[PDB]
């Protein structure tokens, strides 16, 4: 599952935390660690290099190395990862959620901001949101085209440790009104 | 659990659906049915009459029946329920979610919009967001004052049937891009 | 349809117009006259008194004459007409359009702005957009409750005069870019 | 008009639809098919190659093949078609509508977004909105310059299939409030 | 013409001013004094009490003294003046300008903000912008209805002193870039 | 200067703090405690009842008790204090600052939002922002009308403890970027 | 004065007009004709080629003809004219108005939008708004630098014919409410 | 501390001033002169070339002179200063303030607007806000990377003259409401 160091460090933060604002930072850090764990494991299953928040401009420079980085009109986005295969650019973002809400938002943004550069480079740019539902552990991938390339992806993992750390956090701060409504 | 008839109605809808948009509608309707199921069971545990989206003006008329409804300067919000006890008005919203995000949004809006009416009536107005985490089944209530009013509140239920209906929906529409990215 | 004198007024204006801005005001007046024509005929069919743009506050004073208009918290809208029967207030707006866009705008505005006053008065307020598609001439009415009151509505009319005058206007101003791209 | 198989696809969808959201997507697909049908026929009449939604950058690369598409400062629009003759770039958009509203929106956007690139290239860029009113079937074209090139444009078509299918849809969904008040 | 005190005081300010920001304040004060001079002279010709920036609420209380000032929903506008005759409320604003721009803005605002209260009181509210062109000295009045009541208004005045003071200001500060573009 | 028990609490908080977010809350609480200290001392000098954040509606009911709090159209603002003397309502806010910026923002808001209720009650409402510069200890009051009532105000007080507590805080967290740039 | 043919064209338009909107169009067109007449006469006095609304990119190409017009990052403004002298670019707009309002608006926009291009080209860009007051006939130029470049600039003209055309318009439409309040 | 000639000029300005608007300009100029004084002294301590408001584009051309200033996509910002050392670009702004508010606003803006140009040049860009608290004279710098380069910075300076000039100003204009509430 998750790294046993990372686990023990979360446990230490929970145990030493006394203030709602510190607790909320742990809550938020748990969610980002969970997303990143999924990303690393997903990339092992797809057999691709693990990346995080890649500047779009670096993606263009990798796929069309003729491009001049000083001038090219690249959108200001940092997707989790990408794959360029058979002259199709797949732009990948990882998500861990019980809902498709965050996926639709990322999708609409990435799709909209990549149209112009797709037309300039004459390269189709496919936006691929790869989401795992943390309760069912099912994978949901919007892109039919990406799924033809990878028709059977198995990411055999679970989120039980994140669940347990979160329950420990709420065990300790569950009657602090500031924590319960902290952004 | 949920009424057996509500269940079978959802099954028939899922079985007869063929389009992404109908499927997303079912998905949204399962979430509202789940919220309302939690509401009914919560209300039994609080020993209050089950209500849903009560016009604020009707609240005022119940608690101060001499008020002229044509003329009172009052907010236009529709909370799930309320409780008026010892001259304190508790405004209640039910939530089912694994995070606090929707709770903070409703709390901020309800709190901000009831300050003035609270001064005019000379009635303290406490905003009580009652959330159940559908995975852990833990109950989180922001308001210390409400929690002091009650003995330990236990709502011992699960959402397994909603989970199962959702899995059927995804077994049938899980490879439909329009569904996976539908709002 | 519209009476001869109205038709001839439009014919005269179209004949004398030489400028895009004048032509556009004619375009807009024709759509207005079409709407009001439908309204008159619709009301004959429903056997209700014809009205246009009634201030909401007058509606409330008609149905609840004891309300004080100086003090009531009530919305500022002016729907085409209304019907108060069996303690239900139906707020009616007429539309003539091949599309539902204008209906949705009016519906959302009126629905949203009447919720609070519905609660204050304890009178359900039903928003009824009665639209006629002027090509097909089918009537489209959103309100099921209203249609239970009036399940058989026939309005046997036509808009040929309005179509003919608009077609004549766009012909006369067909090489006037300013007119062709002018907004209301 | 549209070919049998297209007509029958719409008939099938309308027949199987039971939900407002499905019905609305049909409404919208019918308007799209009507637009594309006009576009195809219009282009036969003008004797130009039929196109739909051409990226502006491809237009520039067709007319000025030495431009570098990675570096040019150029707008991101996708007009229906274009014509480059006598060193004038005509940017064409097709419209089918009884109103000029949609034309004015497209016109203003394209005009405004193409001024700078017109200056950069030293090529006048003429925005041509070709609209057909589907009731009257008159053609309305804003551009005088374009009309000097094509003073005699005849597109002898009709939209009866589209009207009939829409009328059938609104009949089937005529007591569905959600459909009647649903937006695109 | 303008009061000879007021004149001499403007002249003193011009003569003592050394900074662009003080000068601009004189410019602005000249224009408001000119407007007010016109207002006073206009009111002599119409034979009505001179008023300036009347709270709308005071207007309602004068024409319908039954109204309760604590509750009535009065628009937040302060027109220069008003006349209530034959159950018509004329809301008057003075303008001195070579253009109708400021008139259209005031008209659109006053017209829009007075519709609801017109309907509540059942009193037509006519908005009357009375403008004098300071160069031709012609009077322009939008309201046909107001002009039937006052078919021949003569305001026999001129603005030569304001013109002269302004030219003196520009004589002194005409090469100060800060003054010339000061708001 | 400040209450000794209050000082001790602050010292303890600073000593036990280990996190930027906790430290920033101390920084904020120090600023509000300084504002409130100034307020108490100011109200002693002026011989007025000490208040803090009074809802406008309560001000109205105090000065005009015949008003119906359920119907009156009144602004929703919460100034620090007020003084009603000779049928003039002075609305008071305390400020502690080296700049007039916060004063202007409070002034502009209170002034604008009290014009209508001034008209409705026929009571002049004067906005009085009373600022002490915590370095020079000079008192600055915008309102000449208020200063005619109170021509010599001496609040002979000291903010050295607030300065010292703040310096302790900045010596523990002075190398924490999260703290230095915390909002 | 203005070309005799332009004059007679305006007369015919005024004589054949019957609608408020046509009349306002004439009014707007008289103002633009007046601006452009001032422009032509100003340019003769400055000894520069008459121009109107010059694309900024054409300016850059004239002054730096090696610049690649496809690629230069430049603002999209359309000033009335310009003068490039001793490596200083003077951006010129003509104004006819009795106040500075329209001048401040154009100056702020032109100044803000040319800062970046000025840095990139390494060319100072001075924004020169040249306004004639149509009543006093005085000439006001904001820019000291431009005024230092030139001998005293005299543009000795009047706008009497525009005044007379405007009076004819108002003799015919002065009692038409739609005209008086038309934008 | 500050240049003696500069001091004298300020004293003269304060003595000859009679108007709120002129006084407020002095107040502003005093604050900018204090900021610039701090800047000069700071740059002496750090042994860096004193600069003020450098356009970003000039920074780029200094550090990477092969870039084409006409084509490079670069932010339009004007930080106070910079340091390019070991292929790391430190963007510096000087602040004089008792609060971190202005620092956070400058930081957030510079950070956000330099991310893309960092990617394009492959040069890390660190945002360095250097604030001196004018009361405590303590120096606060957000950037740990910058402080690793410069572990001991002593700017041993004094703002007493600025404080004294400000007090003179507030003793001449302390009873002028227009001044006290001037922006
Ligand atoms: O949620 C995701 O799936 C992300 O990929 C998030 C991400 O990059 C991010 C960016 C800025 C702040 C926090 C998360
Ligand atoms: O999410 C909840 O907890 C609600 O209580 C939702 C609800 O009432 C609602 C109904 C219609 C529109 C928006 C919210
Ligand atoms: O379109 C309709 O159906 C109307 O009923 C329109 C109407 O009353 C109106 C009149 C003037 C301005 C805005 C709307
Ligand atoms: O309406 C038209 O005339 C279009 O040409 C529309 C069109 O291309 C389009 C397609 C998808 C989204 C927005 C516009
Ligand atoms: O221009 C007019 O005609 C006015 O009537 C103006 C007016 O009341 C006013 C209000 C606030 C500030 C300055 C002028
Ligand atoms: O700054 C002041 O002078 C205040 O009087 C502030 C105040 O009331 C307040 C209100 C809400 C939150 C925190 C402070
Ligand atoms: O007023 C001026 O001085 C102009 O120079 C105006 C002008 O060019 C213009 C043209 C079209 C739209 C907006 C302004
Ligand atoms: O406040 C600072 O720290 C500045 O560095 C400010 C600055 O550059 C500036 C820019 C424009 C106008 C006035 C000051
Ligand atoms: Mn990411
Ligand atoms: Mn992600
Ligand atoms: Mn609810
Ligand atoms: Mn709820
Ligand atoms: Mn109407
Ligand atoms: Mn209508
Ligand atoms: Mn298209
Ligand atoms: Mn099209
Ligand atoms: Mn006024
Ligand atoms: Mn006025
Ligand atoms: Mn306060
Ligand atoms: Mn305060
Ligand atoms: Mn121009
Ligand atoms: Mn100009
Ligand atoms: Mn600076
Ligand atoms: Mn600085």
Q: What is the DSSP string of A111-148?
A: HHHHHHHHHHHT--EEEEEEEE-TTT--EEE--HHHHH
Experimental method: X-ray
Cα of D179 to nearest chain C Cα, Å: 9
Are B24 and B159 a contacting pair, CB within 8 Å? no
* Resolution of this entry, Å: 2.2
Are E34 and E10 a contacting pair, CB within 8 Å? no
CA distances from H59 to A30, H38, H69, H83 (A): 40, 22, 11, 9
Rounded Cα distance, F56 and F91, in Å: 9
- DSSP string computed for C129-161: EEEE-TTT--EEE--HHHHHH-S--------HH
After which residues does chain G become discontinuous at a C–N distance over 2.5 Å? Answer: none
CA distances from B139 to A107, B35, C6, E132 (A): 33, 13, 70, 72
Pocket residues: Cβ below 6 A from ligand 1: A 35, 53, 80, 93-95
Among the partner residues B144, B175, B181, nearest to A177 by beta-carbon distance: B144
D67 at G interface, C-beta within 8 A:
yes
Q: Torsion over CA of C168, C169, C171 and C174, rounded to 10 degrees? A: -170
Rounded Cα distance, H1 and A63, in Å: 58
Helix (H) or strand (E) holding G89: strand G88-96
Q: Show the tokens assigned to A79.
A: 């997707």
Q: Is F144 annotated as a binding residue?
A: no
Phi/psi of residue G74, nearest 5 degrees? -135, 155
Rounded Cα distance, B39 and B37, in Å: 5
* DSSP reduced 3-state for G64: coil
- Determine how β-strand E88-96 pairs with β-strand F88-96: unpaired
* DSSP reduced 3-state for G100: coil
The reply to whether ligand 2 has any atom less than 6 angstroms from the CB of B131 is no
Angle at alpha carbon of residue A121, lines to A115 and A124, rounded to 5°: 55
B71 at A interface, C-beta within 8 A:
no
* Dist. CA F124 → ligand 5 center (Å): 21
Within chain D, what is the greatest distance between any pair of CA atoms? 59
Q: What is the CATH number of the domain that holds F145?
A: 3.40.91.60
Residues in a beta bridge with C127 = C91
Rounded Cα distance, G153 and G90, in Å: 16
Among the partner residues F57, F70, F73, nearest to B67 by beta-carbon distance: F70
CA distances from E99 to E80, E106, F3, G98 (A): 19, 13, 65, 11
| C-alpha G95: how far from chain center | 5
Q: Show the tokens assigned to H151.
A: 């572990």
* Dist. CA A105 → ligand 9 center (Å): 13
Handedness of CA B44, B45, B48, B52 (dihedral sign): negative
The reply to whether ligand 7 has any atom less than 6 angstroms from the CB of G35 is yes
C101 at E interface, C-beta within 8 A:
no
Phi/psi of residue C98, nearest 5 degrees? -80, -5
Chain B window 110-169: which residues touch C at a Cβ cutoff of 8 Å? Answer: none
Residue among H32, H53, H108 whose CB has most ligand 8 atoms within 8 A, to mutate: H53
* DSSP reduced 3-state for A16: helix
Q: Show the tokens assigned to H129.
A: 């806000």
Neighbour order of strands in the sheet with G81-85: G81-85, G88-96, G125-132, G139-141
The reply to whether ligand 4 has any atom less than 6 angstroms from the CB of D94 is yes
Rounded Cα distance, G91 and B23, in Å: 61
Within chain C, what is the greatest distance between any pair of CA atoms? 59
Best probe of the B interface among D16, D21, D182, by most B CBs < 10 A, is D21
The full length of chain E comes to 183
Are F56 and F79 a contacting pair, CB within 8 Å? yes
Q: Show the tokens assigned to B103.
A: 């709770």
Closest among H146, H49, A61 to H58, alpha carbons compared: H49
Residues whose CB falls within 8 Å of the CB of residue G116, separated by 6 or more in sequence, listed in order: G73, G75, H55, H57, H76
Rounded Cα distance, D104 and D108, in Å: 6
Task: Quote the number of domains for chain G.
Answer: 1
- Ligand 4: which atom is nearest the Cα of residue D78? 8
* Dist. CA H93 → ligand 8 center (Å): 9
Residue E139 burial by Cβ neighbours in a 10 Å radius (0-12, 13-18, 19+) = middle
Residues in a beta bridge with F94 = F130
D22 at B interface, C-beta within 8 A:
yes
**CA within 13 Å, CB half, A87:** 4
* Dist. CA G10 → ligand 7 center (Å): 20
- Determine how β-strand E125-132 pairs with β-strand B125-132: unpaired
Q: Show the tokens assigned to F168.
A: 């302790």
For chain A, the chains sharing at least 3 beta-carbon pairs closer than 8 angstroms are: B, D, F, H
Q: What is the 3-state secondary structure (H, E, C) of A147-166?
A: HHHCCCCCCCCCCHHHHHHH
Rounded Cα distance, A24 and A30, in Å: 10
Residues of F in contact with B120 (CB under 8 A): 57, 69-70
Residues of G in contact with D119 (CB under 8 A): 55, 57-58, 69
G touches H (3+ CB pairs < 8 Å)? Answer: yes
Closest among A139, A146, A46, A47 to A90, alpha carbons compared: A146
The reply to whether ligand 8 has any atom less than 6 angstroms from the CB of H29 is no
Residue written as tokens 């005529």? D174
Nearest bound ligand to CA G52?
21
Best probe of the A interface among F13, F15, F18, F178, by most A CBs < 10 A, is F18
* DSSP reduced 3-state for E95: strand
Query: Which domain does E121 fall in, by range?
Result: 1-183
Residues with CB under 5 A from ligand 9 (ion): A 53, 80
Q: Show the tokens assigned to D29.
A: 């697909």
Helices marked H in D47-90:
56-63
- DSSP string computed for A51-95: --S--HHHHHHHH-TTS-TTT--------SEEEEETTEEEEEEEE
Beta-carbon separation of G182 and E100 below 8 A: yes
Among the partner residues G142, G174, G183, nearest to E180 by beta-carbon distance: G142
Residue B25 burial by Cβ neighbours in a 10 Å radius (0-12, 13-18, 19+) = middle
| C-alpha F25: how far from chain center | 18
**Chain A residue at shortest CA distance from D58:** A119
Helix (H) or strand (E) holding E132: strand E125-132
Are G128 and G91 a contacting pair, CB within 8 Å? yes
Q: Is B93 annotated as a binding residue?
A: yes
After which residues does chain D become discontinuous at a C–N distance over 2.5 Å? Answer: none
Residue written as tokens 């009692």? G175
Dihedral-angle region of residue H43 (phi above 0 means left; psi in -120 to 50 means alpha; beta otherwise)? alpha
* Dist. CA B131 → ligand 12 center (Å): 9
- Determine how β-strand B125-132 pairs with β-strand B139-141: antiparallel
The reply to whether ligand 8 has any atom less than 6 angstroms from the CB of H126 is no
G28 at C interface, C-beta within 8 A:
no
Residue among F30, F53, F128 whose CB has most ligand 6 atoms within 8 A, to mutate: F53
Among the partner residues D72, D116, D122, nearest to G71 by beta-carbon distance: D72
Are H130 and H141 a contacting pair, CB within 8 Å? yes
Residues in a beta bridge with H104 = none
Closest residue by Cα to atom 3, ligand 3, is: C95
Beta-carbon separation of G135 and E135 below 8 A: yes
Rounded Cα distance, F28 and C141, in Å: 59
Residues in a beta bridge with F111 = none
DSSP state of D55: -
**CA within 13 Å, CB half, B3:** 9
Beta-carbon separation of H119 and A57 below 8 A: yes
For chain D, the chains sharing at least 3 beta-carbon pairs closer than 8 angstroms are: A, B, C, G
**CA within 13 Å, CB half, D39:** 20
Rounded Cα distance, G127 and G107, in Å: 7
Residues of G in contact with E163 (CB under 8 A): 135-136
C76 at E interface, C-beta within 8 A:
yes
G touches F (3+ CB pairs < 8 Å)? Answer: no
First to last CA, chain E: 28
Rounded Cα distance, C166 and C96, in Å: 15
Residues whose CB falls within 8 Å of the CB of residue D87, separated by 6 or more in sequence, listed in order: D123, D124
Rounded Cα distance, D98 and C157, in Å: 20
Q: What is the 3-state secondary structure (H, E, C) of chain B?
A: CCCHHHHHHHHHHHHHCCCHHHHHHHHHHHHHHHHHHHHHHHHHHHCCCCCCCCCHHHHHHHHCCCCCCCCCCCCCCCCCEEEEECCEEEEEEEEECCCCHHHHHHHHHHHHHHHHHHHHHCCCEEEEEEEECCCCCCEEECCHHHHHHCCCCCCCCCCHHHHHHHHHHHHHHCCCHHHHCCC
Residue among D39, D43, D53, D99 whose CB has most ligand 4 atoms within 8 A, to mutate: D53
Are G120 and G157 a contacting pair, CB within 8 Å? no
Q: Show the tokens assigned to E11.
A: 């002249």
H12 at E interface, C-beta within 8 A:
no
Rounded Cα distance, H10 and E116, in Å: 56
* Dist. CA C70 → ligand 17 center (Å): 27
- Beta strand segments in E33-124, E: 81-85, 88-96
Angle at alpha carbon of residue F167, lines to F166 and F168, rounded to 5°: 90
Closest among C60, C172, C76 to C122, alpha carbons compared: C60
Beta-carbon separation of E22 and H21 below 8 A: yes
Rounded Cα distance, C80 and C28, in Å: 18
């Amino acid at each position: 599952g998750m790294d046993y160091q990372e686990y023990q460090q979360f446990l230490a933060r929970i145990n030493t935390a006394r203030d709602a604002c510190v607790a909320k930072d742990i809550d938020v850090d748990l969610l980002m660690a969970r997303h990143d764990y999924f990303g690393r494991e997903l990339c092992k299953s797809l057999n691709i290099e693990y990346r995080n928040d890649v500047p779009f401009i670096d993606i263009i420079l990798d796929i069309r190395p003729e491009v001049d980085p000083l001038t090219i009109d690249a959108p200001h986005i940092t997707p989790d990862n990408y794959l360029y295969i058979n002259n199709v650019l797949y732009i990948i973002d990882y998500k861990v959620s019980v809902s498709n809400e965050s996926s639709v938002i990322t999708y609409d943004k990435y799709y909209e901001l990549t149209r112009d550069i797709s037309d300039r480079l004459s390269i189709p740019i496919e936006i691929v949101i790869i989401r795992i539902d943390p309760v069912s552990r099912d994978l949901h991938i919007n892109s039919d085209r990406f799924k033809e390339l990878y028709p059977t992806i198995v990411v055999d993992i679970n989120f039980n440790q994140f669940f347990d750390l979160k329950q420990l956090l709420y065990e300790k701060f569950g009657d602090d009104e500031e924590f319960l409504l902290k952004v």
